[PDB]
Design a protein around this ligand. Structure first.
Ligand SMILES: [Mg+2]
Ligand SMILES: [Mg+2]
Ligand SMILES: [Mg+2]
Ligand SMILES: [Mg+2]
Ligand SMILES: [Zn+2]
Lengths: 361, 131, 141, 38
RNA sequence: AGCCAGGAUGUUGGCUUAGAAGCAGCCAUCAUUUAAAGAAAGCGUAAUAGCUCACUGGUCGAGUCGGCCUGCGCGGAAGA
């Protein structure tokens, strides 16, 4: 028919998922309820509420006001060339060409919303893939799931770097660590944390029967340059006193010992090893430098442990995709995308398993 | 003002506006209101011309020094703030009346209103407008 | 008794309609009738233009009655409709705009002076030429 | 009122005064600029 | 130096067309009405609103103001 007009029905294909997910009718209808909330004289007495809302109304704009104009252009961009192809108006033929860029850039305005989820989207990330027990079949599938994403990362233009590796005793691997390098590395693979599921007839067992083996693929950026010891002497109360006393008249007179008490925290750091106050100062400053940074490593782990506590209670909800190769069927159990193209999946056909997975997530 | 160069420039420009104009209509209106200065300064550029500028440099040795060539009775308009206004585009035309309508439009004051010329003298309120 | 004491100059975007949600509580400082202005807002745009920001001048007299004074649209948006550009200043050596012809600027000059006053309107014609130059927009003959 | 060995006019309204021979800075706008000694 | 008036015009001026609208990082320094007005010196309010100074006139009307070179002092200067 027309590659120009079918492209419009393909922008429609990208639009309808966003129409159904965020509910652009109810997402629109939410705005008029908060217009009357904001249109009020007694909203000045809660300025924090209005400041939280004054941009919240604008957050609803770029979602609704983009889609509200987007539905109008579907008939408009298609109907422009439809009248231009009849009269063969070559200028009007070229007029609808820029019209194809009208809604697509608006769709790109929603692409901001697609990548809005995240604070390290453009950061480089790691691809850590651990294998389940499963005998050797799970060892092989970790390798089969390695090259699943290793073929895909190079299929899109991302730099693939293999940092760590651990091979199988018989065949396959055990736990490989790939570092995907480039911009938007962690952004696309953010929806890849979670266990993957394989169902196939295992070739490793002699009487080969259908094994249901699993593999997990946890990703994380691990990119930082900010380390704060907070050795600022506005803190760190210094207390100097004299030792126990074994060296006669001298050590009982010299205030050699020293204590380092942190002002915000309260941990004390004493040192009375050497004989000079100048020498015990640097050692007590060193031990305080250790005990303060090691307190920071526990608060890093405390927030990390509470982060896992929202993940350990999930259980059988950490499964991502079901690769049932006995009947040649793929099941993304999160969203509900079924595909019958397992030979093409291993090439890295997961673009269908991202557009459905990431925008809805 | 720096010195004589800028000072005489205020004089010389006013000097050229005496020789060809005839009327002497004055006001001591302190309130140069935003709209009123967009009215009385528009009216000259709507009726007469852009010769009429604000100047209340009324000092007996300053503005009189700007007019020692014609109508030396302008000297006795030497005291306190007063806006001089001649009339070139039609000698002694109706610049006075509509300007006095501003007095009926709440122009604050006009100290010792006299209709200075075209009697060639004082108090006469200029009923006759030779247009 | 009151004529001009509750003076306001407002009216962000005239291209849309129904001022009640965004600017409704602005006239709600004194309790002004929202629809009487909403109709007057819409009885102002439909006659002239309904697609760009135009400013209004309102003053509410005694019994909560107000008079209207429409104002000419600002050159920042009037030359955003004339030149039709989404560029602007802030970056003279990074993002400047193309030129505007003099007569097209004169067409604006006819419209600006028709909604304003002044001694010499041709003098105010050059004043806009400096404004567009400060917006990163070149203007020529 | 701040006690500093070096006093200066922090604002326009900030004036200087030598009350009892003791330099001091007083203000009629922001009563936060009052200074002494100097 | 005081006491009296204004302190404007487009301009709610382009942020990226959430909010500083003479006021956070925004840019840039326009032309006119002109005795006179910087798209700005401060306070202020999500923002505005509002009150002064810049600069200019009237007025009681004379010397006055800002630095530099220096003599001698002042504060900084709290211990048994
Ligand atoms: Mg005393
Ligand atoms: Mg003084
Ligand atoms: Mg000394
Ligand atoms: Mg002393
Ligand atoms: Zn002060």
């Amino acid at each position: 028919i027309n590659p120009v007009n079918n492209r419009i029905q393909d922008l429609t294909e990208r639009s309808d998922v966003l129409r159904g997910y965020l509910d652009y009718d109810a997402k629109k209808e939410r705005l008029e309820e908060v217009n009357a909330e904001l249109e009020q004289p007694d909203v000045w007495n809660e300025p924090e509420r209005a400041q939280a809302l004054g941009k919240e109304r604008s957050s609803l704009e770029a979602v609704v006001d983009t889609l509200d104009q987007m539905k109008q252009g579907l008939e408009d961009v298609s109907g422009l060339l439809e009248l231009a192809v009849e009269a063969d108006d070559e200028e009007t033929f070229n007029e609808a060409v820029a019209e194809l860029d009208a809604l697509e850039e608006k769709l790109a305005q929603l692409e901001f919303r697609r990548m809005f989820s995240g604070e390290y989207d453009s950061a480089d990330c790691y691809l850590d893939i651990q294998a389940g027990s499963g005998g050797t079949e799970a060892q092989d599938w970790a390798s089969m799931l390695e090259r699943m994403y290793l073929r895909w990362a190079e299929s899109r233009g991302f730099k693939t770097e293999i940092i760590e590796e651990s091979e199988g005793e018989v065949a396959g691997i055990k736990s490989v660590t790939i570092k995907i390098s480039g911009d938007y590395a962690y952004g696309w693979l953010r929806t890849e944390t979670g266990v993957h599921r394989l169902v196939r007839k295992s070739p490793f067992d002699s009487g080969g029967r259908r094994h249901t083996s699993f593999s997990s693929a946890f990703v994380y950026p691990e990119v930082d340059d900010d380390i704060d010891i907070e050795i600022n002497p506005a803190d760190l109360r210094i207390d100097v006193y004299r030792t126990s006393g074994a060296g006669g008249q001298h050590v009982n007179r010299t205030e050699s010992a020293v204590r380092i008490t942190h002002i915000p925290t309260g941990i004390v750091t004493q040192c009375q090893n050497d004989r000079s106050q100048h020498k015990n100062k640097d050692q007590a400053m060193k031990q305080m430098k250790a005990k303060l940074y090691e307190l920071e490593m526990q608060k890093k782990n405390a927030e990390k442990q509470a982060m896992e506590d929202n993940k350990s209670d999930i259980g059988w909800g950490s499964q991502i995709r079901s690769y049932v190769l006995d009947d040649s069927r793929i099941k993304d159990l999160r969203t509900g995308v079924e595909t019958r193209n397992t030979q093409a999946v291993l090439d890295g056909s997961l673009d269908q398993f991202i557009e459905a997975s990431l925008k809805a997530g | 003002m720096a010195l004589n160069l800028q000072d005489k420039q205020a004089i010389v420009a006013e000097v050229s506006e005496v020789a060809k104009g005839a009327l002497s209509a004055v006001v001591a209106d302190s309130r140069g209101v935003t709209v009123d200065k967009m009215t009385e300064l528009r009216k000259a550029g709507r009726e007469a011309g852009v010769y009429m500028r604000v100047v209340r440099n009324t000092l007996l040795r300053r503005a009189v020094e700007g007019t020692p060539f014609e109508c030396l009775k302008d000297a006795f308009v030497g005291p306190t703030l007063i806006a001089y206004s001649m009339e070139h585009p039609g000698a002694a035309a109706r610049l006075f009346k509509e300007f006095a309508k501003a007095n009926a439009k709440f122009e604050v004051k006009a100290a010792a209103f006299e209709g200075e010329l075209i009697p060639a003298s004082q108090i006469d309120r200029l009923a006759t407008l030779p247009t | 008794a009151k004529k001009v004491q509750a003076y306001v100059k407002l009216q962000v975007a005239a291209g849309m309609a129904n001022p009640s949600p965004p600017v409704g509580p602005a006239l709600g400082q004194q309790g002004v009738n929202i629809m009487e202005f909403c109709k007057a807002f819409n009885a102002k745009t439909d006659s002239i233009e309904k697609g760009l920001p135009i400013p209004v001048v309102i003053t509410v007299y005694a019994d909560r009655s107000f008079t209207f004074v429409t104002k000419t649209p600002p050159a920042a948006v009037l030359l955003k409709k004339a030149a039709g550009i989404k560029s602007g200043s802030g970056k003279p050596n990074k993002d400047k705009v193309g030129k505007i012809s003099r007569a097209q600027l004169q067409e604006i000059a006819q419209t600006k002076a028709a909604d304003m006053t002044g001694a010499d309107i041709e003098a105010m014609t050059r004043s806009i030429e400096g404004t567009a130059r400060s917006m990163g927009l070149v203007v020529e003959d | 009122m701040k006690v500093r060995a070096s006093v200066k006019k922090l604002c326009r309204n900030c004036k200087i005064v030598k009350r009892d021979g003791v330099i001091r800075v007083i203000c009629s706008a922001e009563p936060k600029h009052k200074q002494r000694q100097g």
